[PDB]
Subunit: 457 residues, 4 copies
């Protein structure tokens, strides 16, 4: 057994199978993908990658399954179950692209709007390619795993079911599907891991305490299926969890300067495409947008490409190059304004492309010498929620009492406190102007105020 030293956790022990899986090009590719993407250009201490995040998530999944097993010997938890859960926690982010959430957040929807792609599909495909190429099946068989069923069990833990829709484990082990990714209420070890790590690196103090949560967790057989349950004295702690998630999102992840830097990087990638060449299986050639359909080509697509565009000399990639150079001089797109949040005038994705035009067509009352077209405006729509899209995540949790540990109850928002939030979803709209001269900024402000007053925000 190896021993690795994590600054966040203590010393992590690794099963030999995990060491075998980690020493592959597919997993080692994560050393060159940043956790927070463009936010590194606002918080200089955020230089961590996904390698340590995956290590920590696997460690925490193993710890949680062990703690659950050693308190209730009637659940019949074996070592192969722990190994499968740890492997699933280890290989849950294999499909991330350059700059992490930017790519599948901004680049793929724009370059190829006819495909529905998420990084979990990429993670599953990467896992399959890794297992097939590196020949891990005999090693798995050596350590007491059954590839035929355990591979599907691991796959379903990452994406979901691909009555009882799962095929990896029976209903008796239903509580094993709510550890790495919870589809019901969103309480899992991923949140704990990146809360701790991001708070450590960014320079902000963390508020949640997951060890206390592990101390009070149980399996209380909710609605004909075994599920993980909490004590009824920890509702406020879960509300605090979600509050700190929201605070992190509004302080760091949705910083407007970081968002505009990400937008500029996406523009550079869009302009530089059709000229970058990537080699895949069979000697075929791919692009940045089309590399997601070949994993041998996807394996060679990391944050390196950024610099490949900055240091290039080809006159064909000149335009994109210029944009990146601006990022190195801090000649960024300027910020004009935003609109107050609203929970009932939602804007769908399909309308995003039409937003800039609406701002360009607004006619301010006072005549202005400067005239701005529809290509001088960037409109960004931000969605803030608790993860359930206007629903209350805490209303899908099951609680038990000290007197009757094996009986599940439900707690309503009115039985906790009157100081809890009245809503659980909102949006924001931000406007940026590409032109940097003062007159253009004044004009953009006039158009923005006219457009906002017209639509009554």
């Amino acid at each position: 057994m190896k021993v690795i030293n994590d600054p966040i956790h203590g010393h992590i022990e690794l099963h030999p199978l995990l060491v075998r899986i980690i020493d592959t090009p597919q997993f080692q590719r994560l050393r060159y993908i940043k956790q927070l993407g463009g936010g590194y250009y606002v918080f200089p201490g955020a230089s961590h990658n996904r390698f340590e995040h995956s290590l920590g998530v696997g460690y925490l999944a193993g710890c949680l399954v062990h703690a659950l097993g050693e308190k209730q010997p009637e659940l019949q938890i074996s070592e192969r179950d722990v190994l499968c859960v740890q492997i699933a926690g280890l290989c849950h982010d294999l499909g991330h692209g350059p700059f992490s959430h930017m790519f599948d957040g901004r680049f793929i929807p724009l370059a190829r709007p006819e495909v529905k792609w998420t990084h979990e599909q990429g993670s599953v495909m990467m896992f399959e390619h890794l297992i097939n190429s590196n020949g891990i099946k005999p090693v798995m068989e050596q350590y007491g795993l059954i590839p035929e069923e355990d591979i599907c069990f691991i796959k379903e833990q990452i994406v979901g079911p691909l009555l009882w829709p799962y095929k990896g484990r029976p209903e008796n082990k239903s509580f094993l599907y709510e550890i790495v990714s919870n589809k019901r209420n969103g309480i899992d070890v991923d949140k704990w891991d990146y809360f701790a790590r991001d708070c450590h690196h960014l320079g902000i103090q963390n508020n949640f305490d997951y060890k206390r949560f592990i101390k009070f967790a149980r399996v209380c057989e909710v609605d004909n299926e075994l599920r993980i349950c909490a004590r009824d004295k920890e509702v406020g702690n879960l509300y605090d969890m979600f509050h700190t998630r929201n605070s992190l999102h509004r302080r760091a992840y949705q910083h407007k300067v970081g968002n505009i830097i990400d937008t500029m990087i996406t523009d550079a990638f869009l302009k530089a495409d059709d000229y970058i060449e990537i080699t895949g299986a069979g000697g075929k050639k791919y692009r940045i947008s089309t590399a997601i359909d070949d994993m041998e080509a996807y394996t060679k697509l990391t944050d390196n490409i950024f610099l490949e565009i900055l240091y290039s000399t080809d006159p064909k990639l000149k335009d994109a190059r210029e944009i990146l150079k601006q990022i190195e001089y801090r000649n960024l797109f300027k910020y004009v304004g935003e609109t107050q949040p609203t929970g009932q005038i939602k804007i769908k994705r399909e309308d995003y492309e039409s937003l800039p035009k609406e701002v360009a067509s607004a006619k301010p009352k006072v005549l202005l010498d400067v005239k701005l077209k529809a290509e001088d405006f960037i409109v960004d729509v931000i969605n803030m929620d608790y993860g359930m899209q206007e629903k209350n995540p805490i209303d899908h949790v099951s609680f038990y009492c000290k007197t009757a540990p094996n009986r599940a109850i439900r707690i309503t928002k009115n039985q906790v406190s009157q100081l809890l939030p009245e809503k659980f979803a909102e949006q924001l709209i931000r406007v940026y102007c590409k032109k940097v001269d003062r007159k253009s900024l004044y004009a953009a402000r006039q158009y923005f105020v006219q457009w906002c007053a017209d639509r009554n925000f």
Copy 2:
């Protein structure tokens, strides 16, 4: 001749000779034997800190804030006298605390002497006067440039309210100096900053607020013909987070059920042990626990020691009280029965609690069980949660400013921040305990409690 003292929360804090002179007095050293969280030490074993270090840290933070404000804007004309007066006020702002701190003025004085209104800030002012008079600090203050006649009143008005522009210590143009140690318009000051960090450090909990950023982004504005401190308009969410952290601390630690019941038992022991404890004051007169607040010589000798004085006693007269304390040693506490759902903070006035238990004894449950319980077998506790105004939003009383127009102060409404902010800012709670340990009486008390709750439609 400036001293250096090391604090585990802050770094190494430097002390002026005048502060060193003031600290080396019995009236200030008395704070070494008064616990901060009181009865909460019996639930959180790490909470053994006292008020001495709290006062030191508050004075240090007040000095730092004044120094930063003077650094940013030279036109404010802040002299050394102002800084030293603010530091002294921060030092002597909690001199009037009694045994187990809040518990005393929270529970004991209102019961033993219900005909008087007493707050520990009045005690702090009286103790400060007694300290200055006894220790002869006036010439020492004069030798360092202070004017006792005006500066003493300035410090007094800093500690308490003003008792048309009502203050007298300074002129109006320095009015921003009155809202550093204690703020009355809202609840932003350095006391909260100090004890948030201290309590989180000692209770094994993580703090969420960062006051250094707030110091980085503070200014002085001329709002309503008054000079007052402003934060920049991008810090609204941080202030909401500050108040959320305050509420979280209150609900997790300060209002713990077992801590509250232990405090109630200690108050009962003190109430029963009175009339048999004599305290010597000025002139050789003898005082009591509830009467010592009328004489500072007797109040100086009243600390947590009295607790143990009742535990180790041998007089037959103090038997009853002694028994109660012994029950705390074996952990035979009053048993939790029930709690009521939250409502607004104004539903039961102060002059109603005495009637609450009797009502629970007047309920007749449908089952109509045996083991009748009298009105003396029930304890009813009323808890009030709020953001500091008990009905209002403190953020509505904060002046902001913008980068483009730093000298112009504005106001930000709740609807302009977010839609996930709390709907209300006040809350009330009721808890019921039973003074019995056998299971049958607990089940009976549960039936009475449910009948009462379903009878007043809470």
Copy 3:
């Protein structure tokens, strides 16, 4: 059932019902009012912790270490009875401190009753016996699978020392006797808790990493008997331990002002004795120095005594009380001199009253007009004691491969008398060859 307690240093500590039963007794709760550093609270404001949390943490650490050792080597045959016994021994290892902790048995008893030899470990054993017999704990232990007769002896031997002398356990469990306390090399959980808590409270960065130590801890046979071993690579690991120990002892435990305040407190206690009465077993009245002969009276001896002297009004206590007042104005005794750490004369706690008399009797070579008696001199004796361990190599997991300081203080603080007292000290040192 299991009870969870939050610790600022460690995480959430789980307590067995037997430990909860032991904790909820007056004898254990007495530890809430005895401070750890003692007189160091008046130099470092943040050091206000007591021995209650220290005992809790030591028990937690001992249990964790035993559990890890038993889990990583199932051939040692460690049962849950041994884990419970070790946890109990760690829990009740410091029941014998008096007021202000190490000062009392270090400074008060020798100066009060020179003919009596007493350590706080004997007090801990006696108080453990009193706690067990006075609260009816034996049936509770029998209810959880323990054998009281042998287990009580096992715990006592874990607290105090005894061709193998121990009788609590057989010869093949010799590694269980060096967890709570180790007199050979000094690797034990008591010191780990000391280091962690003191560094956290005082504000001094710690350097030892005990989790790493527990990670690579094995039991390998040495000298035909089992001992706890350490991997070869962990040589810089168990050097931060000694560096931190030296740093703490130099920076905090031997600070001049703290020692002076301890000296003043002991002087006030000595003057106060013969007037404070404490009720013991049967109603008999004891004294501060004599209370250690009865545990009924010893249970009520805490830091409270301090304030009892300070707030008194009886005219018989005007002297001791006066001394304490000088602490409250920072009118402390005055440092004069220091002398040999060589140890030529390793002064033991049999003649401490004579030392100031010896200093006074010394006649300086140069005549000094100011005369000083033996009532205005104090002698503070600071008795401070790599001891090497048995390592083990990777390829062979089953194979293995004191000073003293004396300071002198002058009660008189006028410069003229201090000048002469400085001259007396050098003559005394020359006479005693220090």
Copy 4:
């Protein structure tokens, strides 16, 4: 306007607009892509920080110390231009680092061009001159009250050494300003405090030094006729603790068994990859990895990207180097053979680095050697292992004052019998030459 940046180590840092103008340049921004440790990132997962934050923190600490010294001793005649100059010097002290930091100038250049002596401080000075002359900073400096020539010389002399008063930036009166950023006499400077704090925070190791106490108690006192930084006589334990922490870091992190091996593998891959990688410089001329240090416009584009340029290549000419990198991706690392002779009785010089594995093969063991070795299978590591002169001052007298070599050898051939033979060759190499 002042600009605030958040550092997890130091809190919130204010930057003067001149520093903000210096920072927002490509020559400073290339530091975002060079790692603090290099190979150590492959043993400690949490050591992924770069030199950008290190430079920021060093500048912050230097400014703080200068301000404190000037404030507590007003007779030292410390102006504001001096504070700005010290901050700039601290900001641009590591501007000349190459890929993977100390591995480059310490290991790659000697093995590639032994005829050239080069340190990264010369690179830092050259890059500072390039940045200033290329980004038009001189008028901006003149705008804020600085004289370009004297201040430029002062900063350069603060970075490099003297370049009986050998300095020219400041007179003999300001002799204490030259030991804040870099101090080669004893080794007490902010550059090392930042190293200690950041490395302990990231790796997980905990340090014991407390630099705030040192700054509080530090003063400036006359020693040997010159003004010098002096510490109170009670700081002896703290200084010993500082040295102990430095020793612990060096023996536990910077000299780990596997990090050095990975560094040697990376250097071998780079050496094989040379002669085929082209870098464009001034005037369109193409340079090499070894010769890029002769031009700064080409040196600007030399970062840790080269690694990924070789690993993700398709040119057959780079196959050999590529293969080596692939081994690092499978943990098929070179093995450990032997280690010998601390204290450097010879103190090897850089010029001999590319001759050591020739004497190892030269040695002829008397034992039976059926398997033969050659001067390719051996890699030589020359890992270096490196109380002081402190002028203390007593409380009662405020104004009165009162390193070894190491060698290791690895075998590229990882066969059991080949490893056995290599373990013999080394013994005769060390015994013949008196190691």
